[PDB]
Swiss-Prot record, chain A:
This is ISWI one complex protein 3. Residues 525-539 are annotated as: Disordered. Present with 1770 molecules/cell in log phase SD medium. GO terms for cellular component: Isw1 complex; Isw1a complex. Functions as a component of the ISW1A complex, which acts in remodeling the chromatin by catalyzing an ATP-dependent alteration in the structure of nucleosomal DNA. The ISW1A complex represses gene expression at initiation through specific positioning of a promoter proximal dinucleosome. The chain holds residues 138 to 746 of 787 of the full protein.
From Swiss-Prot, chain B:
It comes from Saccharomyces cerevisiae (strain ATCC 204508 / S288c). This is ISWI chromatin-remodeling complex ATPase ISW1. Present with 1500 molecules/cell in log phase SD medium. Component of the ISW1A complex, which at least consists of ISW1 and IOC3. Component of the ISW1B complex, which at least consists of ISW1, IOC2 and IOC4. It is found in: Nucleus. Belongs to the SNF2/RAD54 helicase family. ISWI subfamily. The gene is ISW1.
Amino acid sequence: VEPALIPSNWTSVIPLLTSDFKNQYSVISRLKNPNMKPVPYAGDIIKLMAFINKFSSFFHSDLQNLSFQDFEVGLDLYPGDPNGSAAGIVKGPEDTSLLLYPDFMAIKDIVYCQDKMNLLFLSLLDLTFTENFDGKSAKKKGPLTTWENLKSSSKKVFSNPLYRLRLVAREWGYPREWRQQLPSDQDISKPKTALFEQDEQTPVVDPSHPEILTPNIYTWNANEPLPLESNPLYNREMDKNGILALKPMDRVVLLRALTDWCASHSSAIHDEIYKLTHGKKDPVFGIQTQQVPRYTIEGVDNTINQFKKLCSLIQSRYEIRSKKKHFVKQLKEGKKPDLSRKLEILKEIKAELKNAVKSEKDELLFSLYDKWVPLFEGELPDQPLANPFSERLYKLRLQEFFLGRVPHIGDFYMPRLHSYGDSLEMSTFTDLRNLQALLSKFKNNEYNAFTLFENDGQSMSAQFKLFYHDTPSLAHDVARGRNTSGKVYWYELCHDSATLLEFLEFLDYKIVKPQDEKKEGNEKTDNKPSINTNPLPKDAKYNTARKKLQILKEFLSDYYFILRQFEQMKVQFADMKPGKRQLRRIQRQTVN
Amino acid sequence: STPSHPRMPKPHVFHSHQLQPPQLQVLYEKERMWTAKKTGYVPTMDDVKAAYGKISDQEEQKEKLELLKLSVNNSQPLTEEEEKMKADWESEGFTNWNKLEFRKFITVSGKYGRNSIQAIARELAPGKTLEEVRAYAKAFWSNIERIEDYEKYLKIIENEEEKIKRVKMQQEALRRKLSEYKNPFFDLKLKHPPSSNNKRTYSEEEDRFILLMLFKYGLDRDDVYELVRDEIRDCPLFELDFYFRSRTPVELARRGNTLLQCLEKEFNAGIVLDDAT
């Protein structure tokens, strides 16, 4: 007769994504396959989408369905080159010939991706400037950034907003990219570099209080903007034109610079982060810097067990009644609502254990989640089966796109727009239950790409990318000295469902438990054709990794079907307005 | 042509305490009464009421019958042996400082501290060179006791020194705290600073980061946190840490002072610098 409760052990599907995991110098690159390609701008582009997502309520609809690629195509970016953007795209796994987008796709299809970005560029501006004189009274949702403003027959389209930014640009701090560096070498931002007096102090002026607080004045040289000679922010071409005026790489810089400035000056969103960073209830696991869903690290098969354990513990939570004579006999309104259910919930588990005969552990879950909820209400407000992407408590520091991290390797991400909001019917951003159920419907072919177009599937990120983050390197590099300026930590793993499979087949070489310790016996300064790296779990140290790798092969194997449909969705229905009358005929059209 | 009664009554020449021979007033009240006799002046009420300042009655006429006689038998201006005193006395007095100028000296000494002669002798250059700002400085303290107002003077100067010393203390206190960790960006843990009465909006890791950057640029008189704000944004780690990224130099310096203060409550046992030279 003694209950027990541990909130941190059964978080609402939100383990603390700590940085200490990889506190040991462990960075490798034996994953060099034709599909893996460095993408310097990947990081900023990701942030740019993450920002859109977390504040999708403030942005336009057409802005919250951007595919990662829509940025590449839009800003004329190209993966590969560790410097900026590659010269072009590698046509097929074997050609060694590059080509640009105007060759790859069509022009109207490109101007489309371009328009999006400008809308994004103008929306960001107005969001921080023209939307600072707000005077709400309940809830704002009207004044946004119309798709007409961008396509206005005026010149002050960007001219006006930029005028404001050009004024605050100085104080708000320029991005490293554009900051006037000091090649002088004789001066460094960190320490001081200018004495005022060649002699300090010696003969005290008040011997009664020998102190001398200010020996002499020093003057420092902080982060200053690039000269008008080459300052991208003052590009005259940008006014009349759009954001495309700047260099492709620069364009990304600006959009990032904005996504930060806006976060620090937009009276709208800055007051919004406050509303999200000041919850009357703090996350049981404290307030860490980064947060990810449970399954993105625990795994599907491991998160289902955590719920079984949870149920076995919340059963004891009631069977510990030391003085139930007070609750059972006396019938008072307030404490009885719980007591009443304490009888049904028990006469239901007995209506399954005795009414199944080892039928399946499936019914021992799929038909319990609904009734267990009312029980949790009180003890553990959070459990490993609630929709993580539907709780204002985790929202902010939560990190979507996160797919997991493998020890001595790093994290893995995947740009997918529109996480929370409306019509999240198809969105993969839901509780492990509905999620693994949704993916299962595409794997079994029950749900066609057609159903997407029927359930606002186009409100999501059609195309997709699977990136890998070299967190270990970055973590250490930052732990020592901030000489990160010029390094790369983001790496593309695939660009479409097709290559996604190639990556899953490539993922097998690592998940394998090294048993081959003999000789092949086949008898009849660094150069590598493509990829010949298989050995990974050498020592028993990387044992923990083999598992976190396999679980990833799972998510990606199930995420495959739903993603292949999203692709086909945009190919068929190109952001086509479904309508009403036409919405039906397409159903009975039978397209074979 | 025109009378106009040209006759200097009893003018004075002693403003607020600008450090000058307190006994000169008497030496002046001799030629100051002579400048009235030589020109023939009639002692009235404007003089007596401005020489004692009292609404007396029967013993009020005596003063009017005194100040009058003092001017009547006022001997020739200070003797030749007394004249040589004039220059000497007033030569010691630093009355050559405008009230506005003086009131700046007792202010710059605040954000610059007691004996920072150069630091203050530069942010003015009024009367003359540094030597002036030093001479009057030494003279100030050495003979300050002769104060006209030390209430809102010797306190507004001292008080600012406390703050300066506290900041310089937090600086040095921080230095030693970092030398206590090999990799501070991980193993750094505050003993007393850990708060609770307020919502910890910042990540525990973040606080650790903003400290590493305070140590990076020290705690200079002015601009400091605007660099932290930059350093934060520059780092690719918090590339998605939206809250952190959104911290303005102001709403970020806030957390800074909070940490410094809390750090102060820790290393306040070893802040006794041995002064036995």
